[PDB]
Amino acid sequence: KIEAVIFDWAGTTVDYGCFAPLEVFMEIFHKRGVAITAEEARKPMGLLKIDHVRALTEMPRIASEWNRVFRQLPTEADIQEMYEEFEEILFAILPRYASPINGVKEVIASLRERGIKIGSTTGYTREMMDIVAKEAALQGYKPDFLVTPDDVPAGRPYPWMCYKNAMELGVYPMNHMIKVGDTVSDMKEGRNAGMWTVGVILGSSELGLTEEEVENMDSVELREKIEVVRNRFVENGAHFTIETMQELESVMEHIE
Amino acid sequence: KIEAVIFDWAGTTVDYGCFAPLEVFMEIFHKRGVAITAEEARKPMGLLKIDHVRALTEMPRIASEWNRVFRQLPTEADIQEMYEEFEEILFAILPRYASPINGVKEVIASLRERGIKIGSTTGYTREMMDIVAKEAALQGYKPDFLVTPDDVPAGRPYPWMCYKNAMELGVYPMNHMIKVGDTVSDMKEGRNAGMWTVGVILGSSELGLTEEEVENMDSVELREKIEVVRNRFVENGAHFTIETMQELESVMEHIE
Numbered sequence: 284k285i286e287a288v289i290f291d292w293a294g295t296t297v298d299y300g301c302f303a304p305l306e307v308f309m310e311i312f313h314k315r316g317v318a319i320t321a322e323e324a325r326k327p328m329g330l331l332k333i334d335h336v337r338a339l340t341e342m343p344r345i346a347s348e349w350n351r352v353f354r355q356l357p358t359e360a361d362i363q364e365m366y367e368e369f370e371e372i373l374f375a376i377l378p379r380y381a382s383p384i385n386g387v388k389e390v391i392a393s394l395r396e397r398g399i400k401i402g403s404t405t406g407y408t409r410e411m412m413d414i415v416a417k418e419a420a421l422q423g424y425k426p427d428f429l430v431t432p433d434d435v436p437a438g439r440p441y442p443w444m445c446y447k448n449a450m451e452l453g454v455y456p457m458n459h460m461i462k463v464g465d466t467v468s469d470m471k472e473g474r475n476a477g478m479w480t481v482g483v484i485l486g487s488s489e490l491g492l493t494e495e496e497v498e499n500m501d502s503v504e505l506r507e508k509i510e511v512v513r514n515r516f517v518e519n520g521a522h523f524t525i526e527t528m529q530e531l532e533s534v535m536e537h538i539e
Numbered sequence: 540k541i542e543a544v545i546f547d548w549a550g551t552t553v554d555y556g557c558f559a560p561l562e563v564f565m566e567i568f569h570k571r572g573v574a575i576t577a578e579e580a581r582k583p584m585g586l587l588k589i590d591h592v593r594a595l596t597e598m599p600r601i602a603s604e605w606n607r608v609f610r611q612l613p614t615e616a617d618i619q620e621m622y623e624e625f626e627e628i629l630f631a632i633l634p635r636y637a638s639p640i641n642g643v644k645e646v647i648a649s650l651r652e653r654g655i656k657i658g659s660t661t662g663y664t665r666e667m668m669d670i671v672a673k674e675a676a677l678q679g680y681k682p683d684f685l686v687t688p689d690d691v692p693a694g695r696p697y698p699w700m701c702y703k704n705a706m707e708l709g710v711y712p713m714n715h716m717i718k719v720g721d722t723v724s725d726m727k728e729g730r731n732a733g734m735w736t737v738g739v740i741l742g743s744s745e746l747g748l749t750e751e752e753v754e755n756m757d758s759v760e761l762r763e764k765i766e767v768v769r770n771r772f773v774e775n776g777a778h779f780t781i782e783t784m785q786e787l788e789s790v791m792e793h794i795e
């Protein structure tokens with residue numbers, strides 16, 4: 284029997300498409316003269332903040348209208364500088380990216396009515412979680428427990444945060460707990476903690492799309508884009524994969 | 540691949556038969572008309588010494604006599620009095636049982652120069668451990684890290700103290716570590732946390748015999764009482780079986 288399930292935040296239970304970072308970066312470039320495509324910015328997603336900015340600096344169609352504007356090429360100070368402005372802008376807007384993802388509520392309220400327990404981990408800092416968590420409760424969502432990289436020696440990929448959840452909820456053989464996320468980073472955490480690990484595709488920043496794009500998109504442009512993400516999960520630990528949260532119960536039943 | 544070993548304290552790395560509590564466990568009970576056997580008092584060994592006494596009240600033979608000299612089953616006072624007394628009598632001799640089982644230091648130095656990290660769990664309360672380590676350290680042993688039942692929500696059988704060691708030593712997968720102790724409760728802690736669980740016998744508590752009592756020991760008596768203990772372990776989740784701790788450096792290479 285699994286006695287607990289452990290969730291991630293942006294891309295899984297909140298922010299469909301996990302655009303929160305996306306708009307900060309977009310702005311940190313628009314505001315400087317350069318306009319950058321949603322496809323440009325969501326490519327280096329996955330690296331650390333600062334390595335995501337030197338990456339936007341080495342794409343040709345970008346250096347090439349920066350040196351049309353400043354008539355020089357991007358600098359180590361320009362990179363050191365675009366980074367500083369990150370936090371503020373993310374704080375500024377975070378209260379707009381904390382809507383619980385569609386249909387997530389109805390499954391959670393279905394897990395508790397079985398006596399299952401609910402924890403969560405994130406990459407966001409404790410000071411960022413002070414906001415997300417607040418607006419999510421207003422809009423309907425509050426896990427049984429919450430941990431951030433600030434409570435442990437190190438964040439994802441290490442399994443430290445998952446162990447805390449085990450202690451706090453009072454559950455112990457780990458393979459008695461399921462872990463659910465929306466990125467490569469999330470699959471690794473789960474394996475390194477000896478937990479059963481799952482992945483979600485729709486609205487998972489890995490996919491990149493917006494609820495509306497997903498519904499009006501061409502039945503064949505969609506299914507092939509999906510398959511890419513499902514492979515990427517699998518190739519990184521993923522024990523199982525799902526399109527939406529509504530199939531989670533079945534992956535629990537499977538496990539037995 | 541094992542990067543770490545977690546050791547118990549009494550009867551595993553220091554004392555030799557425990558005993559530091561044995562005599563303090565039988566009087567507090569003799570003082571009240573009840574009589575308890577070294578075998579019975581030695582049964583729940585390993586718990587937090589607060590949880591231990593309690594287990595001695597929930598033994599049907601014992602209760603059958605807390606009800607013979609008193610109606611009343613014992614309750615919270617019959618329990619938090621014998622304890623109050625226990626710490627008084629024990630806090631008077633402790634520093635006499637902080638001596639390393641013969642030739643264990645000799646192992647621990649060979650495991651270190653081989654890069655492995657050594658951590659530990661126990662049943663003593665932080666107050667008590669503060670004393671025993673102080674002496675142990677003088678007479679040879681100070682491990683890399685110590686975690687007591689006072690630093691988490693509960694004690695052996697729960698896996699919380701081990702997860703901690705892990706968090707603090709920097710080792711991931713929970714099977715890259717080897718758990719080692721001298722009681723039944725020690726065998727469960729180990730498997731409840733997904734580690735390699737191994738018990739020691741000669742100089743333990745479920746053998747509760749002396750160093751020199753074990754020298755002047757026949758052979759048809761020695762060769763058997765030791766199976767009586769090698770069978771009490773395995774029946775409670777033991778992966779391996781050792782007679783003295785010079786045979787550990789092998790059950791390591793074996794796991795591979």
Ligand SMILES: [Mg+2]
Nearest residue numbers: 293294465466
């Ligand atoms: Mg995510």
Ligand SMILES: [Mg+2]
Nearest residue numbers: 547549550721
């Ligand atoms: Mg012991």
